[PDB]
Amino acid sequence: LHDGFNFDPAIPKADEPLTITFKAPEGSNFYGYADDLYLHSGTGANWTGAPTWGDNQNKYRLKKTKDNVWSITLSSSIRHFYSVAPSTPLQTINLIVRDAEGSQQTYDYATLVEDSQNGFIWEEPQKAPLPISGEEKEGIHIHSATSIMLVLYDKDSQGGHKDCVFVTGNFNNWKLDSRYMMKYDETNHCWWITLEELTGETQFQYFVYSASDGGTYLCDPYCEQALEKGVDTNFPTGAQAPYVSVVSTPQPYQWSGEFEMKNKENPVIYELLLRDFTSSGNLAGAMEKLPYLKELGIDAIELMPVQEFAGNDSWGYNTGLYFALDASYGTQNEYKAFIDACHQNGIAVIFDVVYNHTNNDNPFARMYWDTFNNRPSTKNPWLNAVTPHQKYVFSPDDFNHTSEQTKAFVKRNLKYLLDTYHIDGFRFDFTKGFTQKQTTGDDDLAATDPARVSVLKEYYEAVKAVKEDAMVTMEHFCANEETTLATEGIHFWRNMNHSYCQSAMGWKDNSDFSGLYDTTRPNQFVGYMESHDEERCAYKQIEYGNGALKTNLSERLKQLSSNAAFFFTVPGPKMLWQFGEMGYDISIDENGRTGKKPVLWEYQTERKSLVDIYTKLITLRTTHSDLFNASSQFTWKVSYNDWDNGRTLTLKAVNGKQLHVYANFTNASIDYTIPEGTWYLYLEPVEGEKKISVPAHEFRLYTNFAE
Ligand SMILES: [Ca+2]
Ligand SMILES: [Mn+2]
Fold first, then answer.
1. CA 536 → CA 209, 280, 386, 556, distances in Å?
2. Helices H / strands E in the chain, number of each
């Protein structure tokens, strides 16, 4: 390691001078840089004795001594330089090099310091075989109330590993300590240690170190609880951001009978963001509304991501930890209590899971990091250094889904969420992202990748191996791949937002509903008028409504009612986005796309008429579930050419039950002759072959059966 930081003495000593030599590698910020550079530095986890960013005192100046080479001497001693107390262990220096303007810089790097004065003398790392075998070796193992075994995987894509790992925590006041050095198992490629005499909430992180990488603080990627700096007030002062791991060595949640999702093959799914679902923005808030969701008639709740995400105000598509759920919504047991209450109310729970990308906080990112480019190292075995799909870069931390380490981690995580939280299915976020192919657009990305199809099958098969009746849904939008994968039994998001927005607004152009019903495999496509990612139908009305649909609330709800009568009446699974049932009309853009949205439960009263239409239509799918069987005959007229004389829907079951829907989406009344037979206005007995006047924006729903 001549590239980057060089140390003389080669083992830095707390109470001696240290000369630091920076060599700029080729194709880095400072390669061929003509002027002197400056040191931004401090000791320990919290950068003790750091200057104000940009302080250009001669003291901080790295003199250019050769081409691409700068040196600084911390004179007197490294302790005197940082003004650290003689009895305070000086164990790490954190180092950033920057230009005089503090614009161009290197990123978080630390080296080890030997402090013999304070009894921290370096000991050779020890080789020991893992005292355990089987699957799921890595992570946290409670032996007893006073004892934990930690197992941290360490092998980069080149086959190398770190020189040593310490475990710091509340048991050792967050110091590096020889007694707390982990042992390396070369065969399993794991660091391990058994902590004993713990005295109950154990807090810890790891300090990993090599000569080529320097030092890095990171938590356990398999921790079930975490404190995050900048969110948790009780984040320990001696720990480094972002994460400490929490292990209680605990009052285990007592689950209430066996649960099975209602209408398993064609469920109505309510998409829910806990942050914006209630004013409390949490599980406690959501719990209060389960009787509302039960009566609405839904089969499942789909929670937008609940795994630990950056900060505490997010959609959650920014996961830092996959085995720890975000404490901003509630405790592990509040999550269990919520899912258990859902089940008691006959409602299944689906987790939105985000395996395309993680963030800089993830132990997998922190473990093999590029301190020059501020992204994963080319030697990272889970993550790409650079996103291969350059159209969609949601973070610097894109998962390599051809990695055997990434694949095993995903499958273990899926199994964990099923076993621990008793959930009934998954919605895979951005599965189009599960690709190593170098692309820069939508077309080259959308083009079939056999390895993406292959890994998505692996993840599906893994879920079904844990829970045979678990629902798997993917947000994919790779047309040819969806045809192939739907045959395996994977469910796909079927986005009908554009059509039902056009219809809601009273525009016939691009209003064709037909995409909602896949003729080949209707049950494999989860159709929606709204998702968290789309603008609201009821907002489009205010903004670009045709005539009265702009400003007449009565006519707007009639039109949304008719949309709903050409949605819930259709075979195959369906999804609604929270508050669509009460005509939620705040633009997705209000307070920014992903910003906190107004909570408007008063809409359940003001728009009661629409809530009642949603309720009866969804409930009909349970009361007469045999109608909605994929075996049933389904025909409809919902094209550009089906407008002026209205749109029609006929559903005909094997047992002879029939549903007929007529909708006038136009701004004028249309004359319609009811089909021949004996019918019933199921939502309120009617003779067929009878001419009716159907008012502007209204629907008529007829069943050949009473209740
Ligand atoms: Ca968080
Ligand atoms: Mn990706």
1. 50, 23, 35, 13
2. 15, 34
Closest ligand, as measured to the CA of 312: 1
> How deeply is 657 buried, as exposed, middle or buried, from its count of CB atoms within 10 A (0-12, 13-18, 19+)?
middle
Resolution (A): 1.9
Distances (CA, A) of 246 to 137, 219, 307, 366: 19, 9, 15, 18
- Burial class of residue 520 (count of CB atoms within 10 Å of its CB; 0-12, 13-18, 19+): exposed
Q: What DSSP designation does 371 have?
A: T
Span from the CA of 614 to the centroid of ligand 2 (angstroms): 37
| C-alpha 177 – ligand 1 centre gap (Å) | 29
Tokens at residue 209, please? 């170190």
Q: Which of 289, 349, 364, 368 is nearest to 319 (CA)?
A: 364
Looking at the CA of 436, name the nearest ligand. 2
Q: How far is the CA of 261 from the centre of ligand 1 (A)?
A: 30
Ligand nearest to the CA of 306: 1
What would you report as the CA-atom Rg of the chain, rounded to the nearest whole angstrom?
Answer: 30
Sign of CA pseudo-dihedral 295, 297, 303, 304: negative
Q: Give 423 Cα–ligand 1 centroid separation in angstroms.
A: 21
Q: How far is the CA of 67 from the centre of ligand 2 (A)?
A: 39
Q: Solved by what technique?
A: X-ray
How far is Cα 696 from Cα 556, in angstroms, rounded to an integer?
A: 11
8 A C-beta contact, residue 432 and residue 392: yes
Among residues 276, 226, 131, 330, the alpha carbon closest in space to that of 600 is found at 276
- Whether cis (ω within 30° of 0) applies to the bond prior to 450 is no
145, 249 contact by CB (below 8 A): yes
CA pair distance 357, 624, nearest whole angstrom? 42
Residue at 138: amino acid letter: E
The conformation of residue 593, written as its DSSP 8-state character, comes to T
Q: How far is the CA of 333 from the centre of ligand 1 (A)?
A: 17
CA of 242 to the centre of ligand 1 (A): 10
Enter the tokens of residue 234. Answer: 């009780």
Beta-carbon contacts of residue 473 (< 8 Å; ≥ 6 apart): 302, 350, 425, 426, 427, 428, 490, 491, 492, 493, 526
- How many A from CA of 312 to the centre of ligand 1? 5
Kindly give the pairing relationship between strand 268-272 and strand 243-248: unpaired
In this structure, which ligand is nearest to the CA of 305? 1
| Alpha carbons 707 and 217: distance in angstroms, whole number | 64
Ligand 1: distance of its center to the CA of 530 in Å?
27
Strand 147-153 relative to strand 190-195, pairing: antiparallel
Expressed in angstroms and rounded, the spacing between residue 431 Cα and the centre of ligand 2 is 8
Query: What are the two backbone dihedrals, phi and then psi, of residue 60, each rounded to the nearest 5 degrees?
Result: -100, 0
